[model samples]
Target: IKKKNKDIRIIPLGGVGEIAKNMYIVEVDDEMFMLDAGLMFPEDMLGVDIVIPDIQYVIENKERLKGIFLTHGAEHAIGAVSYVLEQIDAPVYGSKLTIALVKEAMKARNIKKKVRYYTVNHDSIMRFKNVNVSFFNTTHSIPDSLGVCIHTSYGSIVYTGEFKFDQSLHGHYAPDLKRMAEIGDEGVFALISDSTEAEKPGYNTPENIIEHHMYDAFAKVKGRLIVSCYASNFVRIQQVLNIASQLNRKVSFLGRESSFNIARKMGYFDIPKDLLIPINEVENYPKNEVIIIATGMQGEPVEALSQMARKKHKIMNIEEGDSIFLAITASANMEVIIADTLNELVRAGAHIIPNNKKIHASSHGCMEELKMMLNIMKPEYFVPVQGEFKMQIAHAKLAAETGVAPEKIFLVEKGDVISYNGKDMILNEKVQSGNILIDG
Candidate 1:
């Protein structure tokens, strides 16, 4: 039913359900604005291509669509842009780092579109369509991660990209608390938060803490080293590359094309043209002079880490004197593949670093960090994203205990639309806003 009086109605094409593709639709009067077009890389994805939210809703109402805004460059926001973009024609706005990452994502799929990118910084604002888009600095493990605030006639709707509240950023970047406080003071009508450390508590230690541990691991090993980490880990990669250079070791990047391309653009490491020593060059240097960093910390079969573990990596092999370091954290399928990697290393008589207190760290926020953000943002309406249901619930509870009313705290699922009509805020409608995985 079309109402006579126009008001803002916000809808989330995706939410917490499975933690992947997140698309949102916001309509004010006759004009509409969407936020974050993305996809999820699903597990057990048989022969099907990547999964993405059906842009059917927006397509049918194309006339009302004005623009799309991204909170950050994570796949959940950038992955499905090309997919949905094939249907809608709208300008995309995000941070410089975010635009670079999104362009790489599209290039990975071999899809080229004439995209207009509007770069944002720590505290910048742009008037797009009918909404005032404001991107403020928020510290995440990745450089240029941010919190997006959409200012409408009613109030402010803040969408936080993945984040943590750790004071220890390892000198990479820091979250902007002053901006968050300012927004809180101006009054926040709704807050879409991240749930990575919902169950976990307190502020996270600086990243250098883990780099020191990894540095020690490299020090202890006396053979050629191969490390597997997440693809989006630019800061960790920087730490690894710096450590490698200092140890008088040359490094080689081994991975799927997507991982390599994104790393190159993310400022993780500036790969010198000569630094890319060929696999043949592995023998040119002493065992102490070689370190290989590859993708597949998630146990992706096609990724270099998995291939190397199975003794099928084209340019690498597990040898009697080699050392393999599992630098990325695992949750499920990764645990299984990681087990396979360890077994393969043991069989080949190679040294292995387990996921104990040994040599690794996650870019996610911890318990204390989550609490700090809640205390600072002080949102009246809170919903957690980027974590499992249990994690989201824990985060919502955290918000309640930290001053957000228990009644106001919402435990959300993927595809749940959160709407605001100035007075009555509700969660209604639904969309297939989940992850999309495109195979090579």
Candidate 2:
């Protein structure tokens, strides 16, 4: 018996017209698959711990939910996995590092549910009754990052999850251009891409350049080197470890211990046995021979570097002649706190090296790279996700410049549902979508 074809609907539960809390739904016939379950930090909200997508829609249709697919381990990509799992029973799909990070997040939240986690690589493929799913590697701040491709009878829907086409990246961090091209050859129906840096003019600076900058700083510092960055940015952390090893300095981590342990155990971080030292033993070594890799790049008050800057750290304190390298730029709404943290560090007689010196590279692709992705996929329809409204509009404009018809580009909000039949695509309806505040 011949079966009637059904239209596929793509819905965004979050991560549209905003920067964080990325969750998307791809529904083929009756089956629904989530792309990423991410969370966003509260801004100016009193007593709020974190913000997550309201999964009322998913909860209502839990029986049709197939699985949750993660693209990376960044907080904006997979931070809300535990919260989602608490409400729904669905298998989680991700790379080894991404899956480990999700497990660590779940453990930290004291989640008691027995979750099914499928560790996937670029070659792995999962076939569902309605659609087939596959992954392609993408270079980002973290190792084992991936882009998802959902194959339907109409065409393939590709999600370029937070990527930059940096040719310099290799091994686990390398982008699979061949796979991307192969997918393009098979035909892409709709391309859902990251618009985080769409407003920028050129391609992102390569990770190697950041490594060189860090190496220069490591060579110039005569005292202890204190590097602060985002804990999930394993590429940058690996570069720091590489530099410290070459300089014969002992490295110690100060915060986000679970991330380091998970990454190291997965072989994503290549730390020499002798190069890593315990945080408590940092004082045993000479100041000039020590390096501290701490978290607090955004300058939150409780992070390791911030605690040290305020002389409140129980283990170490900022001291004279110490070099503090802030490897990340201040995120949105974090300028004031970061400025205050810098002032405190400077007052404590530490030499400050800010991110403005180009010591750090962004994981997101810029305009040129986005244009290249559009050209590679050659999709019939374009949808820009993972940025603010303005940035998504900018990406749509870039797609227009790169030969995608303006009418074919969709600048949708979080809850808008777009449906694609075998012939054409159209905006169908809306769904229940918004942020849900979580407090401990």
Among the numbered candidates, top lDDT falls to 2
- Give model 1 RMSD, 1 decimal: 3.8
Off by over 4 Å in 1: 1-10, 29-31, 48-50, 170-172, 256-276, 296-302, 332-348, 356-360, 432-437
CA lDDT, every model vs. true structure: 0.68, 0.85
Extract clashing residue pairs from model 2.
Answer: none
How many pairs collide in each candidate, listed in order?
A: 17, 0
Candidate 2 achieves a global lDDT of 0.85
Candidate 1 lDDT at 144 equals: 72
Q: Write the per-residue lDDT of candidate 1 for residues 149-240, one digit (tens) a residue.
A: 87765567788877765555633367777888888888776677777666655555567777777788788879889877655666667777
Cα error of candidate 1 at position 382, Å: 0.8
Error of 1 at 237 (Å): 0.5
